[PDB]
Design a protein around this ligand. Structure first.
Ligand SMILES: CC(C)c1nc2c(C(=O)Nc3cccc(CN)c3)cccc2[nH]1
Lengths: 39, 156
């Protein structure tokens, strides 16, 4: 049996840690819901 | 049990201790999470039970107690916030500019942030606080890093 526990509110927070790049990737989604890179 | 709107941890006791297997959003009495988190199994919320209502393996999404309620979309230009709820760690908002998963059926937003697999289902937000999708289904790029799609469902 799985159970849920509250972790917080859903709000936009100003001055949050800004990180991560923005790559453009050629992908494919299969019938099992798994993404793969197309090359 | 607790049906207050917000972000929640999805825990399991089947394994050692209490392990976090994913995250979800409670909105308008509906719990929204990734399919690979629960496999469509029932959830507990204190003494109350939550039953699956809609689910799809290909989309990798599942809703409990009602139909999928989240319908905000990424505008394709602005930065977003991943409200990452990692196992054993406090919820933190990480601001990022998404990339693009180019597919044969159209382009989809993508957040290039690495978090443990149990962070799956954490919401991605717009500047208005609206849930534009869930984090946890994507690809592993050349250096072992994870790039997740911005996964959103359809509001019927
Ligand atoms: C690469 C690794 C560190 C990592 N894996 C992940 C995953 C992950 O493996 N998700 C997953 C698993 C099973 C099935 C599906 C749906 N087809 C998605 C989710 C979030 C962050 C991650 N970081």
């Amino acid at each position: 049996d799985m159970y849920i526990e509250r972790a917080g509110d859903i709000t936009w927070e100003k001055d949050a840690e800004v990180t991560g790049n923005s790559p453009r990737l050629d992908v494919a989604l299969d019938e099992s819901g798994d993404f793969s890179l197309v090359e | 049990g607790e049906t207050t709107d917000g972000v929640y941890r999805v825990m399991t006791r089947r394994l050692l201790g209490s392990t976090q297997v994913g995250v979800g959003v409670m909105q308008e009495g509906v719990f929204h999470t990734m399919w690979h988190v629960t496999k469509g199994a029932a959830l507990r919320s204190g003494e109350g039970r939550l039953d699956p209502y809609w689910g799809d393996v290909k989309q990798d999404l599942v809703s409990y107690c009602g139909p999928w309620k989240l319908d905000a979309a990424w505008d394709g230009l602005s930065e977003v916030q991943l409200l990452a709820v990692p196992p054993g760690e406090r919820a933190k908002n990480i601001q990022t500019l998404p990339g693009i998963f180019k597919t044969k059926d159209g382009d989809i937003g993508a957040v290039a942030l690495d978090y443990p697999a149990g962070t799956s289902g954490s919401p991605i937000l717009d500047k208005c606080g609206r849930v534009i999708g869930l984090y946890g289904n994507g690809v592993v790029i050349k250096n072992g890093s994870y790039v997740s799609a911005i996964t959103q469902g359809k509001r019927e």
